[PDB]
Design an enzyme around this catalytic site. Structure first.
Site, PDB file in Angstrom:
ATOM      1  N   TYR A  90     -23.397  38.559  23.138  1.00  0.00           N
ATOM      2  CA  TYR A  90     -24.321  39.344  22.941  1.00  0.00           C
ATOM      3  C   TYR A  90     -25.616  38.690  23.430  1.00  0.00           C
ATOM      4  CZ  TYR A  90     -27.099  43.329  21.059  1.00  0.00           C
ATOM      5  OH  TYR A  90     -27.767  44.346  20.707  1.00  0.00           O
TER       6      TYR A  90
ATOM      7  N   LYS B 223     -33.434  41.764  20.397  1.00  0.00           N
ATOM      8  CA  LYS B 223     -33.422  42.559  19.133  1.00  0.00           C
ATOM      9  C   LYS B 223     -34.367  41.885  17.947  1.00  0.00           C
ATOM     10  CE  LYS B 223     -30.759  46.011  20.321  1.00  0.00           C
ATOM     11  NZ  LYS B 223     -31.464  47.387  20.260  1.00  0.00           N
TER      12      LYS B 223
HETATM   13  N1  LIG Z   1     -23.221  51.145  20.483  1.00  0.00           N
HETATM   14  C1  LIG Z   1     -23.127  50.233  19.516  1.00  0.00           C
HETATM   15  O1  LIG Z   1     -22.063  50.079  19.103  1.00  0.00           O
HETATM   16  C2  LIG Z   1     -24.600  49.915  18.927  1.00  0.00           C
HETATM   17  C3  LIG Z   1     -24.710  49.288  17.658  1.00  0.00           C
HETATM   18  C4  LIG Z   1     -25.817  48.541  17.150  1.00  0.00           C
HETATM   19  C5  LIG Z   1     -27.108  48.897  18.077  1.00  0.00           C
HETATM   20  N2  LIG Z   1     -26.970  49.722  18.974  1.00  0.00           N
HETATM   21  C6  LIG Z   1     -28.153  50.110  19.678  1.00  0.00           C
HETATM   22  O2  LIG Z   1     -28.599  51.560  19.743  1.00  0.00           O
HETATM   23  C7  LIG Z   1     -29.333  51.935  20.857  1.00  0.00           C
HETATM   24  C8  LIG Z   1     -28.516  52.935  21.622  1.00  0.00           C
HETATM   25  O3  LIG Z   1     -27.417  52.561  22.286  1.00  0.00           O
HETATM   26  P1  LIG Z   1     -26.056  53.239  22.593  1.00  0.00           P
HETATM   27  O4  LIG Z   1     -24.862  52.746  22.044  1.00  0.00           O
HETATM   28  O5  LIG Z   1     -26.210  54.968  22.220  1.00  0.00           O
HETATM   29  O6  LIG Z   1     -26.104  53.359  24.300  1.00  0.00           O
HETATM   30  P2  LIG Z   1     -26.189  54.610  25.163  1.00  0.00           P
HETATM   31  O7  LIG Z   1     -25.985  54.046  26.405  1.00  0.00           O
HETATM   32  O8  LIG Z   1     -25.462  55.647  24.673  1.00  0.00           O
HETATM   33  O9  LIG Z   1     -27.704  55.024  25.116  1.00  0.00           O
HETATM   34  C9  LIG Z   1     -28.943  54.006  25.209  1.00  0.00           C
HETATM   35  C10 LIG Z   1     -30.076  54.838  26.267  1.00  0.00           C
HETATM   36  O10 LIG Z   1     -30.804  53.986  26.790  1.00  0.00           O
HETATM   37  C11 LIG Z   1     -31.401  54.580  27.940  1.00  0.00           C
HETATM   38  N3  LIG Z   1     -32.418  53.951  28.633  1.00  0.00           N
HETATM   39  C12 LIG Z   1     -32.177  52.446  29.457  1.00  0.00           C
HETATM   40  N4  LIG Z   1     -33.175  52.241  30.269  1.00  0.00           N
HETATM   41  C13 LIG Z   1     -34.021  52.818  29.886  1.00  0.00           C
HETATM   42  C14 LIG Z   1     -35.358  53.136  30.454  1.00  0.00           C
HETATM   43  N5  LIG Z   1     -35.747  52.155  31.221  1.00  0.00           N
HETATM   44  N6  LIG Z   1     -36.050  54.068  30.407  1.00  0.00           N
HETATM   45  C15 LIG Z   1     -35.683  55.269  29.440  1.00  0.00           C
HETATM   46  N7  LIG Z   1     -34.372  55.086  28.913  1.00  0.00           N
HETATM   47  C16 LIG Z   1     -33.741  54.002  29.274  1.00  0.00           C
HETATM   48  C17 LIG Z   1     -30.403  55.305  28.454  1.00  0.00           C
HETATM   49  O11 LIG Z   1     -30.513  56.514  29.143  1.00  0.00           O
HETATM   50  C18 LIG Z   1     -29.248  55.395  27.328  1.00  0.00           C
HETATM   51  O12 LIG Z   1     -29.243  56.793  27.038  1.00  0.00           O
HETATM   52  C19 LIG Z   1     -29.612  50.630  21.715  1.00  0.00           C
HETATM   53  O13 LIG Z   1     -30.935  50.173  21.231  1.00  0.00           O
HETATM   54  C20 LIG Z   1     -28.479  49.598  21.316  1.00  0.00           C
HETATM   55  O14 LIG Z   1     -28.744  48.344  21.189  1.00  0.00           O
HETATM   56  C21 LIG Z   1     -25.787  50.249  19.713  1.00  0.00           C
END
Ligand SMILES: NC(=O)c1ccc[n+]([C@@H]2O[C@H](COP(=O)([O-])OP(=O)(O)OC[C@H]3O[C@@H](n4cnc5c(N)ncnc54)[C@H](O)[C@@H]3O)[C@@H](O)[C@H]2O)c1
Ligand SMILES: NC(=O)c1ccc[n+]([C@@H]2O[C@H](COP(=O)([O-])OP(=O)(O)OC[C@H]3O[C@@H](n4cnc5c(N)ncnc54)[C@H](O)[C@@H]3O)[C@@H](O)[C@H]2O)c1
Ligand SMILES: NC(=O)c1ccc[n+]([C@@H]2O[C@H](COP(=O)([O-])OP(=O)(O)OC[C@H]3O[C@@H](n4cnc5c(N)ncnc54)[C@H](O)[C@@H]3O)[C@@H](O)[C@H]2O)c1
Ligand SMILES: NC(=O)c1ccc[n+]([C@@H]2O[C@H](COP(=O)([O-])OP(=O)(O)OC[C@H]3O[C@@H](n4cnc5c(N)ncnc54)[C@H](O)[C@@H]3O)[C@@H](O)[C@H]2O)c1
Lengths: 248, 248, 248, 248
Positions: C155, C162
C-alpha cells in the site's frame, strides 16, 4: 548506570525466564538497589537466590489479592527502605479455564472478577499502599499485551483485564504526576515464560524476531529511570513493531 | 555511555534551544560519535561550533527539499563514515501563512505540498539515500507532535504533515526492519525553540511542567541505542502525559 | 427516506463496482437528490448514464488536481444548487510504480507529492471552493483505508496519504463545526473495484466476509444524514471488524 | 423504518432523560418492536409506562449483577420472542464514593470489583444467557465514554471499567461474528441524565454543542439496523467531535 541511586521493588520474578527477571538484571546492571517480592512460600528460597545475585537481600512475601498482605509487605520493606523510587508490577493471572476456546463461552463472572482483580487492580492497590513512601521523581511500571487493544484468540478475558490495566496507567499517572511520580506500561510481544504463535510473530514482525526479556528489561530499566522523565501514562510497545504492521 | 560505538548523524540543529541540540548533547554524553548537517550557509560556521563541542568536525550542508543535495551530503559523509548507525531527523516546516487562523481558510495546495514534502517526505528521502550505508542494528529517529492525532488550533496543515510522517515511521520501520534497522518517532510536548500555550500545558500536564530538550534528548538517545532494540515503528509520547489526560 | 430534503454531490463514480456508486444508490434510495462529477472525457459517458438511472441530470466535470477545475465545477453547480448539503469525496490516486515492492525503494518525491495532493489535499480543496454554499447541517464524507494506521505491504505511500487524509478529516471538522458542517470518513475494508488479500480478509474478519459497496453505501448514507448529527471528525471502520482483530 | 422486522431488547430506561430512552424512541420510530427490562421495584412502574407509550408490553425484571436474574429474564423473553435481534446495554454503576477526588485515593478493591462487574462483565453475561436466541443479523450495542481512553478527573475507576468494556466489545465481536452477530459501542459525550463540564464541552466541541439523547438514539438505531452490516467491534464516538480536538 543510569539507575544509580534509585531504589526499586520488583514483583513477579518466578524464574530465570520471567520478564521480571530480565528487568531486574538490567536495572541492577545500571546500578539500581533492588528488592523483591514473592507470591508464596513455594517460591521464597528460590527468589532469595535471585536477589543475592543482584546485590539484594530484601525478599518479601506478598499476595496482591489481599490488601493486608500488601500493607504488611510494605511495612517490612519500610524497615530497610523508609523511602524508595518505584516498583515493577509484573503480575498476571486468570483461572485456567478462562484462556481457551470461544471467548463468550469461556468467560465467567468469577473468571472476569479474578483476572481484573489480580492483573489490573493489584497495580493501583500497590501504589495506594506505598504512595507516601515514594520519592520525588519515582516511577511505576507494569506489563501489558496487545490483547488489550485487539481481540486475540484464546487471550479472552485477560484482554479486558489488560485494557483496564492500561487505563489504570493513565489514571494513576494523572493523579500521581503532581507529586513527582510517573506511571507507564510496556506492552511486550510474546515471550516464552504458542510455539506456533512465536513462529508467526517472528516472520510478521518488522524486526523479524520475537523480543526478549533482555529487550523488555532495557526498556523497563529506561522507563523507570530519570532518562524517561518526560514520559508518563504511556504504553510503550516493545514487540518489534508487530502491532503497527498488517498483512505481512 | 549506552551509545558508545555508534555513529549518528544529526540534522536540524539551529540553536542551543533546538530539540536537535538537546538530542546531540545527550547522545554525545552517552558516547556516540556525532556528525551534523545544516540547511544553508547562513548557519554553517555556527553549526561547526556546536559540532566541535560534541567532539565532531563532520559538518555537512544539506537541504532536504533537494534529492541532489541529500545525495551529495551523504557522499561527503561517506568519506569519513563509510558506514554509520542512523540519523536524527529533526526538520519541520510550512509557509508562514499556513499556521494561523481557520485551517480551511489558511491551507493552500502549495502550502500543503511544501509542509508534507519538507516535514514528512524528507524523512524517507534521507533513509533512501543512505540505506546501503547503515549497519545492522541501526536506528532512525524523527520528531512529531500531538497535532497529528488531534485537531489543534493554528497548527493547521502541519498536523496533516505530521500524521503523514507518523505513518511514514510505520512503513519505513516495516520495510527496513528485515535488514536490522528500526525507525520510530518522538511526539514532543511544546518546547520554546505560545507563552499561553506553554502556560496551559504546564497546569494540565500530569507531570505539571512542560518537557525539555533534555527530556527529549534522553528519550532520543535511548530510542537510537540498542537499549530500545525491541521497539520499532513507535511514536513515543515525551510530553509528560499531556495527550493521555482530558479536562484537567 | 432519511436523506429526503438532502442535496448531495458525489464524486468518483467510475463503474457499477465503484464505492461511490454503491454510495449514490444508497443515498438515492434514502431520498437524496444527487449531483455527479466525472474526472475526464473517458468517464463522462459512464457517469451521465448513471446519473440518469439515479434520476439526476447534474453531471459536471472536475479534476481535483486543479484549483480552477474545482471552482468552475462549483460555479456550475451553484446555478442549479445555490446551496446543497455536502459531498462525497471518493477519490484516490498514486502513480503506478508507487504501490508494489519494498516501501522505501518504491517511494519517490514525485510519487509522494501526487498521492498526497490527489488523495488528501483535494478533500479540503473541495471544501474551500464550496464552503459558502453548504447549508448548516451539511456533512462531508471521504474514504480511507486501514493502511493509514498500520504498515500494509505494497500500500506503501498511499498509507501516508490516507493518514494525512484522516487528519484532514479532524482539522476540517474542527474548523467547519461552528458553521454547522460535519466531516467524517469511512475506513473501508478491501473491495474488488488481491484475490488472496480478499481470501485472507474473509476468514480472519469478525463478520466472516469482506464488506460490500452496499455496506459502505448504507454507512455513507448514514454519515451524511441528520441521523449522525452527533458524529464529527470520526473515522468509522466499515471493515467487518477486521482491524480490531489480530492473530486470527 | 430501517428497523422494521427487528425485535430488540432495551435495558436501562430510568427516565425520559435516560440515554436508553432516546434510543428506544429512535428505534421505535424506525419501526423496531421493543422489549424492556427494569432493575428493581422502584423502576418497574416508570418502565411499564414507557413501554406502553412505545407500544410494548414486554416489561421484564433484570439485575445484571446476578446470573440467575439474567437467565430468568431471558427465559421470560423467550416465551414471547423465541428469537430476537439483539439488545441495547445501557447500564452503568460504581459505588458513590468512587467518583470524586484523587483517583488513587478514591479507588478500592470493592469499588473496582463492582464498577467492572456491573459496567463491563454484565454486557457479555447478557450475551451468554441469550446467545442461542439471536437471529443471524443481530446486533448488540453498549455505551461507553471518553474516560476509557483519557484520564478524566473524577471519572476515576469508571474509566478503567469502560476500557474493560470497550475491549469486551472487541472480544465479543470477534467471537460472535461467525454466527451473524455484530457488537458495537457508542462513546457518547456528556449528557444531563457538571454544569461546567457541559459548559466547557459545548465551546470546545467541533459541532459547538453537547450531544442529545436524540443524537445518540439515531446512531444507536443505525448501529442495530442492517444499515451497519459492515460495522463490528467498533467504538463509534458520538460526542460532536470533542475527543478529536485539543487545546481548543
Ligand atoms: N476498493 C477498495 O477496496 C477500497 C478500500 C478502502 C478505501 N477505498 C477508497 O475509496 C475511494 C474510492 O476508490 P474505488 O475503489 O471506488 O476506486 P475507483 O477507481 O472506482 O474510483 C475513484 C475515482 O478517483 C477518481 N479520480 C482520480 N483522480 C482524480 C482527479 N485528479 N480528479 C477527479 N477525480 C479523480 C476517478 O475518476 C475514480 O472514479 C478511494 O479514496 C479509495 O482509496 C477503496
Ligand atoms: N510472557 C509473555 O508472552 C508476556 C507478554 C507480554 C506481557 N506479559 C505480562 O508480563 C507480566 C509477567 O508475566 P510473565 O510472562 O513474566 O510470567 P511469570 O509467570 O514469569 O510472572 C508473573 C507473576 O505473577 C505472579 N502472581 C500471580 N498471582 C499473584 C498474586 N496473587 N500475588 C502476587 N504475585 C502473583 C507470580 O508470582 C509470577 O511470578 C504479566 O502481567 C503478563 O501478562 C507476558
Ligand atoms: N518546538 C516544539 O514545540 C516542538 C514540539 C514537538 C515536535 N517538534 C518538531 O521537532 C522538529 C525540530 O523542531 P524545533 O522545535 O527543534 O525547531 P528548529 O527550528 O530548532 O529546528 C528545525 C530545523 O528545520 C531545519 N530545516 C528547515 N527546512 C530545511 C530544509 N529544507 N533542509 C534541511 N533542513 C531544514 C532547519 O535547519 C532547522 O534547524 C520539527 O520536526 C518539529 O516539528 C517541535
Ligand atoms: N449521561 C451521560 O452523560 C453519559 C455519557 C456517556 C456514556 N454514558 C453511558 O450510558 C449508559 C447509560 O447511562 P445514563 O446516563 O442513561 O444513566 P441512567 O441512570 O439514566 O441509566 C442507567 C441504568 O443503569 C441501570 N442499572 C444499574 N445497575 C443495574 C443492575 N445491577 N442491573 C440492571 N440494571 C442496572 C439502572 O436501572 C439505570 O436505568 C451508561 O453505561 C453510561 O456509562 C452516559
Amino acid at each position: 548506570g543510569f539507575l544509580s541511586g534509585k531504589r526499586i521493588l520488583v514483583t513477579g520474578v518466578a524464574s530465570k525466564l520471567s520478564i521480571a527477571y530480565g528487568i531486574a538484571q538490567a536495572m541492577h546492571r545500571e546500578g539500581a538497589e533492588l528488592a523483591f517480592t514473592y507470591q508464596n512460600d513455594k517460591l521464597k528460597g528460590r527468589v532469595e537466590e535471585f536477589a543475592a545475585q543482584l546485590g539484594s537481600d530484601i525478599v518479601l512475601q506478598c499476595d496482591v489479592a489481599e490488601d493486608a498482605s500488601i500493607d504488611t509487605m510494605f511495612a517490612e520493606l519500610g524497615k530497610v527502605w523508609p523511602k524508595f523510587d518505584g516498583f515493577v508490577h509484573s503480575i498476571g493471572f486468570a483461572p485456567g479455564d478462562q484462556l481457551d476456546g470461544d471467548y463468550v463461552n469461556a468467560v465467567t463472572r468469577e473468571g472476569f472478577k479474578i483476572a481484573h482483580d489480580i492483573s489490573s487492580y493489584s497495580f493501583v492497590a500497590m501504589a495506594k499502599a506505598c504512595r507516601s513512601m515514594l520519592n520525588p521523581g519515582s516511577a511505576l511500571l507494569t506489563l501489558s499485551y496487545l490483547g488489550a487493544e485487539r481481540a486475540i484468540p484464546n487471550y479472552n478475558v485477560m484482554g479486558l483485564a489488560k485494557a483496564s490495566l492500561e487505563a489504570n496507567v493513565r489514571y494513576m499517572a494523572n493523579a500521581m504526576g503532581p507529586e513527582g511520580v510517573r506511571v507507564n506500561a510496556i506492552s511486550a510481544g510474546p515471550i516464552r515464560t504458542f510455539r506456533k504463535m512465536l513462529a508467526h510473530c517472528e516472520a510478521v514482525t518488522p524486526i523479524r524476531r520475537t523480543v526478549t526479556i533482555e529487550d523488555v528489561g532495557n526498556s523497563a530499566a529506561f522507563l523507570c529511570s530519570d532518562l524517561s522523565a518526560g514520559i508518563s501514562g504511556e504504553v510503550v510497545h516493545v514487540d518489534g513493531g508487530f502491532s503497527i504492521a498488517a498483512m505481512n
